[PDB]
C-alpha cells in the first residue's frame, strides 16, 4: 500500500495515476490494461459496426469508422467499394476483442498483483526515468516494433491482398501495389510540401505507390532508429535540451500526439486515397465539386452553354478559372479547385476541366457518383440530421469524415493542452517549484525591480 | 449482420462498446469504496 | 447511521441518474419529438 493515499504520495485521488510514476510494475499494468482497452474498443466497436451493418448501404451511410479502415486495407471489398465478404471485418473484431482479455489479464496482473516495481525482479525490465540510455532502449525497442508495424502494412499492400485503390482504373478496386515509390525525393518531397491549399503537406498523398513506399521509408528508418537508440545513449547536446523525467517524456509524447491528431483530422478531411470516399464518404472538397458537377451535368443535358453560362457576378456559373488559370468548377466551390477525385479526372485535361470532355464525354457512373456525393456531403448535425443546419429531419447522415475529424480535433487539442500541462509541470518539477514558491527564498524578492 | 451462428449473442454485442466507458466510471466506484483516501 | 457504505449509495444513485438520462436520451429517438 505505497502511493495510495495523499499521506504517502503527495498526490490526490484525481491525480492518483501520478502516484504510479515511480512504480514500474504498476505503471506497466496501467499501460497494458489501457492497451487492452484500446484493443477492446477496436474489437467491440468492429463487432458493433458489423452487427449493425447493411452491405447494401454504403459504409458512410451507416456511421461506420472502423469497417472503413479494414476495407481500406483490402479486406472483403471488391469493385467500387462493395462488400463481398464481411468475415474479414468480423475476424478483425474477434482477434482484437479476444486479445483484449490477454492484455486485460496482464494489465490487471501487473497493476493489482505483480511486483510494484520492476527494478528488483528484472534489471532488463526495471527502468529509472532519469536513466537516459535505458530510456532509449525502450525507445529503440518500440521504434523497431513500429518499424515492424509499418512494414506489415507494406506486406498487406504488396503480398497479402493489396489495399483498396481509389484511383484504380474503371472505378475503385483492391490493387496489389507492386511498384511502390522508393524514390526519397518523392517520399521526402511530401515533407517539404506546403500545408496550404494546392500543396497539402502530406495529406496530398494521392496514390498508393507513395503510401507503400513511404511506409518502406518510415518502416525502415524506425527499424534503423530502433537499432540506433538500442545501441546508443543520448548525446550531450540532447541531455541539456531535455528534461529527463517520467512526466517529461509523457509531455513529449502528448505534444507528438497533438501533432498526429491534428494531421489525421486533416487526412480524413482532405485525403480520399488512404480514406476512400467509397468507405468514408466524399470529402468537404469532394462534395462541393460534386454539386457543381451535377448541375454542370443537369443543365448541359438541357442544352446550357456551360462554358459561356455566367453567374450573377460575372464569373462562370459552371466553369470559371482558378487564380492560376485552370478551368475549374464555378460557384463557391472555387475554393475547392485543388480537389482531386477519380470521378472527375476524365474531365480534367491540361487546362483544368476540358469543356469538350464535359459535352460528349461524361459517363453515367460519374453523374451517379456526383449526385451521390452531393447528397452525402460531410455536413450534418450532432443528433445526426444530414444536410445544413436549416435542413429538416429526414436524412440520418453524418459522414465518418466529419465524425473522425471532429473527434480527433477534440482529442488533439486537449493533447496539446495536456502537453502544455505536462511540459510546464515536468520542467517545474525538475527545477523544484511545482509545489509552489518557497517563502524563505522567493526569487522575485531576490530579483531586481523593473521601474 | 453478424454470421448467422452469432445472432443469439447479438444483444450482447449491442452493449459491448459501452464497457470501455464504464471502466472510467469504475475507477470512481473503486475510489469511492476507499473513500478517495 | 453509517451502516450502509456511502459509496454503494453513491454508485447506485449515480446509476439511477444514467438509467434515467439514458431513458431520456432513448426517448429522443422514440415516440413524440422523434421526427418520425
Amino acid at each position: 500500500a505505497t502511493n495510495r493515499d495523499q499521506e504517502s504520495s503527495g498526490f490526490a485521488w484525481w491525480a492518483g495515476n501520478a502516484r504510479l510514476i515511480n512504480l514500474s510494475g504498476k505503471l506497466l499494468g496501467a499501460h497494458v490494461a489501457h492497451a487492452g482497452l484500446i484493443v477492446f474498443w477496436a474489437g467491440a466497436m468492429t463487432l458493433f459496426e458489423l452487427a449493425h451493418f447493411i452491405p447494401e448501404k454504403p459504409m458512410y451511410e451507416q456511421g461506420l469508422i472502423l469497417i472503413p479502415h479494414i476495407a481500406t486495407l483490402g479486406w472483403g471489398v471488391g469493385p467500387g467499394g462493395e462488400v463481398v465478404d464481411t468475415f474479414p471485418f468480423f475476424v478483425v473484431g474477434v482477434v482484437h476483442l479476444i486479445s483484449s482479455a490477454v492484455l486485460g489479464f496482464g494489465g490487471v496482473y501487473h497493476a493489482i498483483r505483480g511486483p510494484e516495481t520492476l527494478e528488483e525482479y528484472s534489471s532488463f525490465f526495471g527502468y529509472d526515468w532519469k536513466d537516459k540510455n535505458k530510456m532509449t532502449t525502450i525507445l529503440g525497442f518500440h521504434l523497431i516494433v513500429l518499424g515492424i508495424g509499418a512494414l506489415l502494412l507494406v506486406a498487406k499492400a504488396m503480398f497479402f491482398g493489396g489495399l483498396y485503390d481509389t484511383w484504380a482504373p474503371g472505378g475503385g478496386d483492391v490493387r496489389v501495389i507492386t511498384n511502390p515509390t522508393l524514390d526519397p525525393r518523392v517520399i521526402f518531397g511530401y515533407l517539404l510540401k506546403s500545408p496550404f491549399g494546392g500543396e497539402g503537406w502530406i495529406v496530398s498523398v494521392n496514390n498508393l505507390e507513395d503510401v507503400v513506399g513511404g511506409h518502406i521509408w518510415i518502416g525502415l528508418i524506425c527499424i534503423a532508429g530502433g537499432i540506433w537508440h538500442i545501441l546508443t545513449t543520448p548525446f550531450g547536446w540532447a541531455r541539456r535540451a531535455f528534461i529527463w523525467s517520467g512526466e517529461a517524456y509523457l509531455s513529449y509524447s502528448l505534444g507528438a500526439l497533438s501533432m498526429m491528431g491534428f494531421i489525421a483530422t486533416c487526412f480524413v478531411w482532405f485525403n480520399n486515397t488512404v480514406y476512400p470516399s467509397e468507405f468514408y464518404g466524399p470529402t468537404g472538397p469532394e462534395a462541393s465539386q460534386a454539386q457543381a458537377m451535377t448541375f454542370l451535368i443537369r443543365d448541359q443535358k438541357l442544352g446550357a452553354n456551360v462554358g459561356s453560362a455566367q453567374g450573377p457576378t460575372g464569373l462562370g456559373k459552371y466553369l470559371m478559372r482558378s487564380p492560376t488559370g485552370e478551368i475549374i468548377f464555378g460557384g463557391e466551390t472555387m475554393r475547392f479547385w485543388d480537389f482531386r477525385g477519380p470521378w472527375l479526372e476524365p474531365l480534367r485535361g491540361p487546362n483544368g476541366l476540358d469543356l469538350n470532355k464535359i459535352k460528349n464525354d461524361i459517363q453515367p457512373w460519374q453523374e451517379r457518383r456526383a449526385a451521390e456525393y452531393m447528397t452525402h456531403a460531410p455536413l450534418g448535425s450532432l443528433n445526426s440530421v444530414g444536410g445544413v443546419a436549416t435542413e429538416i429531419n429526414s436524412v440520418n447522415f453524418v459522414s465518418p469524415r466529419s465524425w473522425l475529424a471532429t473527434s480527433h480535433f477534440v482529442l488533439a487539442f486537449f493533447f496539446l493542452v495536456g502537453h502544455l500541462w505536462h511540459a510546464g509541470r515536468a520542467r517545474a518539477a525538475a527545477a523544484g517549484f511545482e509545489k509552489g514558491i518557497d517563502r524563505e527564498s522567493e526569487p522575485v524578492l531576490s530579483m531586481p525591480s523593473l521601474d | 449482420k453478424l454470421p448467422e451462428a452469432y445472432a443469439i449473442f447479438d444483444p450482447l454485442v449491442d452493449v459491448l462498446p459501452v464497457i470501455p466507458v464504464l471502466f472510467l466510471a469504475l475507477a470512481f466506484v473503486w475510489q469511492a469504496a476507499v473513500g478517495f483516501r | 447511521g453509517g451502516r450502509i457504505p456511502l459509496w454503494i449509495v453513491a454508485t447506485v444513485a449515480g446509476m439511477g441518474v444514467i438509467v434515467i438520462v439514458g431513458l431520456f436520451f432513448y426517448g429522443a429517438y422514440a415516440g413524440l419529438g422523434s421526427s418520425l
Binding site: 500500500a1 493489482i112 | 444483444p11 450482447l12 449491442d14 452493449v15 459501452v18 464497457i19 464504464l22 471502466f23 466510471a25 469504475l26 466506484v29 473503486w30 469504496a33 476507499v34 | 457504505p5 459509496w7 454503494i8 454508485t11 446509476m15
Partner: peptide
C-alpha cells in the same frame, strides 16, 4: 434483451469492488 446484458455487464463492475470491500481485499 440488450438491457439485461448491460445490466449484468454494468452491475458486475462494482460487484468486483463490492467483493473486495466485503472481503477486506486490496481495495
Amino acid at each position: 434483451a440488450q438491457l439485461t446484458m448491460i445490466a449484468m455487464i454494468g452491475i458486475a463492475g462494482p460487484m468486483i469492488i463490492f467483493l473486495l470491500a466485503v472481503r477486506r481485499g486490496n481495495l
